[PDB]
Amino acid sequence: MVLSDGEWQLVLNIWAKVEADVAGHGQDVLIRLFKGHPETLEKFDKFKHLKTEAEMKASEDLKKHGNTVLTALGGILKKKGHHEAELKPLAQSHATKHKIPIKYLEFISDAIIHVLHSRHPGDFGADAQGAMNKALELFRKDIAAKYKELGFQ
Ligand code: HEM
Structure with missing residues (x-):
């Protein structure tokens, strides 16, 4: 389920813009996740004390974790169609340690x-949106395959 060269270029072109403020993007992503799907917040022992959006926004540890998440995802995306080594330890920890269902990866x-659309209305047009959908689909597909191996799928 392979992205074209042009599709990868669109993905990494918007990602280079994310990298101007990785932590801010990452914090916004986690806030959107936790507000839209509160069951996801409950998987984070270290964030489950946060009861409001303002508290989430004020948490420096949440911002740091947002940086961690998007930096790791950036590493995966820059490997394009060959991200096996980067994806492996992530699937492992998320399956066995953190116990994160694939559905939460969809969320x-x-x-x-x-968040990409919110922060980049002009640059993140339909072509880039579609290519980013495909890149994140491939990420989920490959994680789900590792989950299946490990009996978490
Ligand atoms: C784009 C998808 C994701 C990426 C790239 C990502 C990345 C990471 C990384 C790099 C770490 C630290 C290293 C590790 O333990 O593997 C981590 C930890 C963790 N992740 Fe994720 N993650 C993602 C999605 C999620 C989701 C959706 C959830 C929960 C709903 C989640 C829950 C956790 C938890 C609970 C930890 C440990 C937090 C702590 O330090 O207390 N992850 N993640």
């Missing part, structure tokens, strides 16, 4: 798309 994928 965060949608949150990323939402």
Whole structure:
């Protein structure tokens, strides 16, 4: 389920803009995730104390984790169609340690798309949106395959 060269270029072109403020994007993504799907917040022992959007926005640890998430995703995206090594430890920890259903990965994928549109209305047009959908679909597909191996799928 392979992206074209042009599709990868669109993905990484918008991603280079994310990289001007990775932590801010990452915090926005986690806030969108937690507000839209509160069950996801409950998987984070270290964030479940946050009861309001303002509290989420004020948390420096949440911002840091947002940076961690998007920096790791950036690493995956820059490997384009060959991200096996980067994806492996992530699937492993999310399956066995953090116990994160694939469905929650769908939720965060949608949150990323939402945030990219919110912050970049002009640059993140339909072509880039579609290419980013495909890149995040491939991410989910490959994680789900590792989950299946490990009996978490
Ligand atoms: C784009 C998708 C995601 C990426 C790239 C990502 C990345 C990471 C990374 C790099 C870490 C630290 C290293 C590790 O433990 O593997 C981490 C930790 C963690 N992730 Fe994710 N993650 C993603 C999605 C999610 C989702 C959707 C959830 C929950 C709904 C989640 C829950 C957790 C938890 C609970 C930890 C440990 C947090 C702590 O330090 O207390 N992850 N994630």
